[PDB]
């Protein structure tokens, strides 16, 4: 029983875990051509299967923005940063995203350790490509070092926010994700780390990737993208990059955080000899799922939706389909129970965040009570027949019901149960067994009243940071149809779970509509109003002893916030002052919920 | 408690072990200039530290034959293995090998599951740098696609043995080994595994990588080498190779697999954030040191030997120091009590080979109950006194001495526990402890006499190899002194332990110098004579079903054994049959023993 509190991730056409929502709801394939900005991509294109490495050339799924970065807010160097890959920088930047969405500080994750934090780092990805750029420049003349060493990408996010535990980086064909999940899980279990975060991230920025993707015959023709049935011959690449936040489900229900799934069980293995390499082995498919349901303990007719692997290959559906139905059959001899589907449909192929995505995918689902459609499957494989598996392919947007069966003479409403399976080429496969969280009692006292007034208050590096932030709350609080049940959530996210920062704005409010008006007032170009707050922390520095080596006023700040006199202490909070918000919370602790996190600026850094 | 009952590797200047140990106790520094087989390697030396990526350039530890294989061994197109990673052919040898040496065979190590085995893979390995090749190739024209997917070097490995367990390619920065090693003995604890093969790999084949690490200033100057004291500034980086084979003890106990070692604990971590990166930790490495001795259940006193991180860098070395000494001053204030050195000073830095290189070291002098000299620590860091440190850097070959202490009023003589550190660049730090195994019970019951003779037959796929195979096993029979005690041993572990091949030579003998001297004579072009059985298996094909589907010609088997007429059943079993040696021995069964592995061709490959 592992529980997952926080997640993040961008994915090809989406910057957000809600766009990716909105695009998979809606049905979008959102796979397009090259961007010009890479590679010219006219040298290589021929239209047929002959030497220049192309021919299966204007096809994938690409996340905007990949030489984008704020080095600045993690200390480090312009220089620096122009050589440092970009899978580091975007999974760095993934991270601290998850970790805001969990609504924890990197200063008080896992913190109970007295001088950090034990929180171990998984990191999934397949092959770097941004040193083979100073290997043409090197060839060519002058000279260039990029080096890989793929664990800088989880050693600079373990640095950076100054983490004790296990930092790697597992590699396994397309299972990487899986794989790094697995052994995060299995950590927490044996107490070796307290939080952990798993995660994958693959980019394709080097043509070498397509040319030998069609040099070997793994490419998809000219075929848009994956096709789960009807002559499928191939699949399409993508770009992707997840990560997910780990930790116990008795320590998340304890300390408040909200939660997607709990993963109840995992399970990985090779394949071994078959009757020639990149040829999977159903037998060996079964055995990691049924090890993985008993792991989990888990019925298979209890089971509503898998993800597969999916990659819509001619020799690839059937065996996986075989290896499932395989393993199900074992229990269970009905048929058109669950239901099957694939994101890579939708966003191609990652090799690396495949995993991930599903996950993500799997997630929203969960989380917004709905069966999404998939792609391409309108009239599926002829070699195989539906009719004897246990699985229909999704066409459609649809309620996900909860299961309700009748096992042993005993009638049962199970809970959502899920299954995500993802096999590599080489022979390693790994699969994960997922299930809802059910809330015992759901109940706020009526905290907010005029006792007790709301306080907001944001932070950021600068003006336009800032700016940025309270635009994409308010667009937030439209779009999530957030409510004034939840305004003591909202305040202790932002309270505990934001670091504090140059610039500061605090505002106090009664109703939900009281703080959009005035959020909006803000963005108006206007300077002095009522109840609004605003200041620097480095212009003002002679008083930071007087405040900090001094009890009494600790004293004066008690007494005021029992009165409630929020006013004056946060016309000095937004100037210097370290404040407890815990203490402001005598008891009833309000729970975490998902806000929009820091949003990093889009400064351009490459070689 | 995992039992280590095979290992392999390739170093610098070194082909086995019995070479390896050679050169470690003979104190030869076995790191010379880049050979001219590699890059031309006078484009980039300059002298000075200005901009042409050398000026650390004819300073590295090299294997010979790096481009040599055998790939119809393994049934692979040359075309293929033109264009397949060097470090993955080298570590499918190294894993064939660690299993000959261990006395198991690929059909019947981990075998007890009726389809293959369940045997984990684990392999440690930093970056490739092969495709680099094929950017500058594709830069200056032409079309060539090398990729890396570093998970191969494991995958194929798990594809040509047949093995169903996990196969993952861990990343942590010059600790990769240790890391491996982490995870196979926790997933052998978990059960997920019965067997594992943990190891690492390093090849250097790319001047970018010296470009790097001059660009970066982790270069050594034009010192020769690491020097663990006396100024010195940076370390060399070498090639280098290995594999371990890892089992639990009882079950190689039972099973009477010869042990090197035995490893009682493990661990690893990060330094977290520093003043800087790349700059490591005193307090985490006290901490992981700390775990590692915990989770082994050992007392620091008890400790004699312990290899450290080493690189001879001049902010490493005090650092590493005072964490050994903070981690041990906790339980003991003695001082000089230990022992501490590194095989860097010997073959270089491998980066990724370096914690297997660690092991096999520490195996080899736990073997031969010899401490080795140290190089280059003739003087000593002034900066740091070692006198109130527990550690005294050994200088010349010694005695292992069996440490005999007085704890807590109790005197003691405890076993030879030895220790080995690996802290990454990125602050990824890993620790093992290892202590020797002692046997319970030695006693052949003088299984040798006229009543049953020894039987000794080796296989091989040609003339060539089998004449390889025989002088090796003479030179062998010479160089560690075999006696004729051990012919029982040599003969199970021939049977049990070769797979049977299409050239099979066969001999009955009585004494170890008959067997020397029939061999010989076979070594002499002699084609008639008595007790020599030379055959084929496929130009004889014809009485296979006659001998197949025939059961009273077993009985006839049976009987004749019983008989002890071994002539005629390897006067046929040199030609095609299959037979159970294990039904040979009743009882009483003789343990395994290391002997020299397949003589593989030496074909060149690239591109």
Redesign the interface.
């Known amino acids: 029983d592992i529980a997952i509190i926080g997640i993040s991730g961008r994915y090809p056409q989406a910057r957000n875990i809600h766009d990716f929502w909105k695009n998979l709801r809606d049905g979008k394939d959102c796979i397009t051509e090259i961007p010009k900005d890479r590679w010219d991509h006219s040298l290589y294109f021929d239209e047929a299967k002959d030497?220049?490495?192309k021919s299966y050339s204007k096809w994938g799924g690409f996340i905007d923005g990949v030489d984008q970065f704020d080095p600045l807010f993690f200390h480090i160097s312009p220089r620096e940063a122009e050589l440092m890959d970009p899978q580091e920088r975007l999974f760095l930047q993934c991270v601290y995203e998850t970790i805001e969405d969990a609504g924890y500080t990197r200063e008080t994750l896992g913190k109970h350790e007295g001088?950090?934090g034990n929180v171990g780092?998984y990191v999934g990805v397949?092959?770097?490509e941004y040193?083979?750029?100073?290997?043409?420049e090197?060839?060519?003349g002058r000279?260039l070092?990029?080096?890989?060493?793929?664990?800088?990408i989880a050693?600079?996010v373990?640095?950076?926010?100054?983490?004790?535990?296990?930092?790697?980086?597992?590699?396994?064909?397309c299972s990487s994700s899986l794989?790094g999940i697995h052994?995060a899980c299995?950590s927490l279990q044996?107490g070796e780390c307290e939080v952990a975060i798993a995660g994958g991230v693959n980019v394709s920025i080097?043509?070498?990737?397509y040319?030998?993707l069609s040099?070997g015959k793994f490419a998809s023709s000219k075929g848009r993208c994956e096709s789960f049935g009807e002559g499928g011959d191939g699949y399409v690449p993508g770009e992707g990059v997840g990560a997910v936040l780990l930790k116990p489900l008795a320590r998340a229900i304890a300390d408040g955080d909200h939660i997607y799934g709990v993963i109840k069980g995992s399970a990985?293995?090779?394949?071994?000899?078959?009757n020639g390499?990149t040829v999977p082995n159903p037998?060996?498919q079964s055995?990691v799922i049924r090890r993985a349901f008993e792991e989990a303990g888990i019925h298979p007719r209890t089971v509503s939706y898998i993800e597969a692997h999916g990659t819509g290959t001619s020799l690839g559906d059937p065996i996986e389909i075989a290896g499932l139905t395989k393993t199900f059959q074992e229990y269970t001899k009905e048929n058109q129970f669950c239901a099957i589907g694939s994101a890579k449909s939708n966003i191609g192929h990652g090799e690396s965040a495949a995993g991930i995505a599903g996950l993500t995918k799997i997630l929203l689902q969960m989380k917004y009570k709905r069966l999404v459609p998939s792609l391409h499957s309108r009239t599926l494989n002829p070699n195989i027949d539906f009719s004897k598996t246990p699985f229909v392919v999704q066409q459609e947007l649809a309620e996900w019901k909860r299961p309700v069966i009748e096992i042993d003479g005993v009638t049962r409403e199970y809970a959502r149960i899920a299954g995500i399976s993802s096999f590599?080429a080489?022979?390693?496969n790994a699969h994960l067994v997922i299930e809802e969280y059910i809330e015992a009692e759901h109940r706020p006292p009526s905290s907010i009243s005029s006792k007790n007034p709301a306080v907001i208050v944001l932070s950021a590096k600068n003006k336009d940071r800032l700016r940025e932030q309270v635009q994409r709350l308010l667009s937030a609080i439209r779009e999530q149809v957030l409510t004034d049940n939840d305004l003591a959530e909202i305040a202790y996210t932002l309270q505990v779970g934001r670091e504090a920062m140059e610039e500061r704005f605090a505002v106090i409010v009664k109703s939900i509509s009281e703080l959009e008006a005035k959020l909006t007032y803000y963005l108006k170009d206007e300077a002095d109003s009522p109840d609004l707050f605003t200041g620097q922390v480095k212009r003002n520095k002679e008083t930071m002893d007087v405040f900090a080596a001094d009890e009494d006023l600790q004293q004066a700040i008690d007494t005021w916030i029992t009165k409630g006199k929020y006013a004056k202490i946060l016309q000095m909070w937004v100037q210097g002052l370290i404040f407890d918000w815990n203490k402001l919370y005598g008891d009833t602790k309000p729970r975490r919920i998902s806000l929009p996190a820091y949003p990093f600026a889009r400064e351009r850094y490459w070689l």
Chains 1, 2 share one sequence.
């Open positions: 030497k220049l490495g001088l950090g780092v397949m092959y770097e040193q083979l750029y100073a290997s043409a090197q060839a060519l000279a070092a990029i080096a890989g060493s793929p664990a800088s050693n600079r373990s640095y950076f926010c100054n983490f004790h535990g296990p930092s790697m980086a597992v590699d396994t064909m794989t052994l299995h044996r080097h043509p070498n990737k040319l030998y040099q990985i293995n090779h394949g071994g000899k078959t390499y037998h060996s055995r590599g080489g022979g390693a």
